[PDB]
Design a protein around this ligand. Structure first.
Ligand SMILES: CO[C@@H]1[C@@H](OC(N)=O)[C@@H](O)[C@H](Oc2ccc3c(O)c(NC(=O)c4ccc(O)c(CC=C(C)C)c4)c(=O)oc3c2C)OC1(C)C
Length: 198
């Protein structure tokens, strides 16, 4: 029920769902979550991939979203982040809502966390967890990957424009010294790297 308010008023949260601004806002909200991990001093690389299947991945080398079950809540902290709107201040719509809104408006979302020597994943359909967050391997790395398929029920157009993403990612690179920002478009075999060390 945590995501019901977003399913009911997608436009209020993400912006215009027709003109493509709301659609690209979905990527920017996930990137903003990775930028916060960089501002916290924990992340210095963010990779945005537009996939052949038209889904988008955002991967960071941050701490990784915490995976521990808060008995209070009964589920992994990550599931709380993905299925409950935060309480802080917040293309039209709201700026800084983060991944909960993106989850709600995605037909599918796949979460991978690299944390505490372990690889954890969870899948959502339209914001509903399909199974509890689970361990699937070991890793020496840390960070978070969010891959999402924006809902064809919510957005009249679902094809990401590599130029709109590239232009905003260059602004963010300039605004965030020391963060290596990579954009990959597998549809056209493009890679851009923006690295402003300052
Ligand atoms: C979408 O998640 C975002 C994160 O996005 C990314 N890409 O990392 C990032 O923006 C930021 O991530 C934080 C924000 C706060 C803490 C944080 O305070 C940590 N400190 C702890 O000792 C800790 C350890 C376990 C634990 O369950 C929690 C609370 C869990 C939270 C805040 C989800 C905190 C920690 O390890 O990781 C943190 C992380 C990874 O805030 C989220 C979780 C909403």
């Amino acid at each position: 029920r945590g995501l019901d308010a977003v399913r009911k008023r997608p436009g209020m949260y993400i912006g215009d769902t027709d003109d493509g601004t709301g659609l690209h806002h979905m990527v920017f909200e996930v990137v903003d979550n990775a930028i916060d991990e960089a501002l916290a001093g924990h992340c210095d690389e963010i990779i945005v991939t537009i996939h052949e299947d038209e889904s988008v991945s955002v991967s960071d080398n941050g701490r990784g979203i915490p995976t521990d079950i808060h008995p209070e809540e009964g589920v992994s902290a990550a599931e709380v982040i993905l299925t409950i709107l935060h309480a802080g201040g917040k293309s039209g719509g709201l700026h800084g809502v983060g991944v909960s809104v993106v989850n709600a408006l995605s037909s599918k979302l796949h979460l991978t966390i690299y944390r505490a020597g372990q690889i954890h994943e969870q899948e959502y359909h339209h914001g509903d967890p399909q199974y509890p967050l689970r361990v699937i391997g070991e890793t020496d790395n840390t960070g978070t990957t969010v891959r999402f398929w924006p809902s064809a029920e919510t957005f009249s157009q679902t094809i990401f424009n590599v130029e709109i993403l590239a232009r905003r990612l260059r602004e963010l690179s300039f605004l965030n010294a020391g963060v290596r920002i990579v954009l990959r478009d597998e549809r056209i075999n493009l890679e851009h790297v923006y690295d402003y060390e300052g």
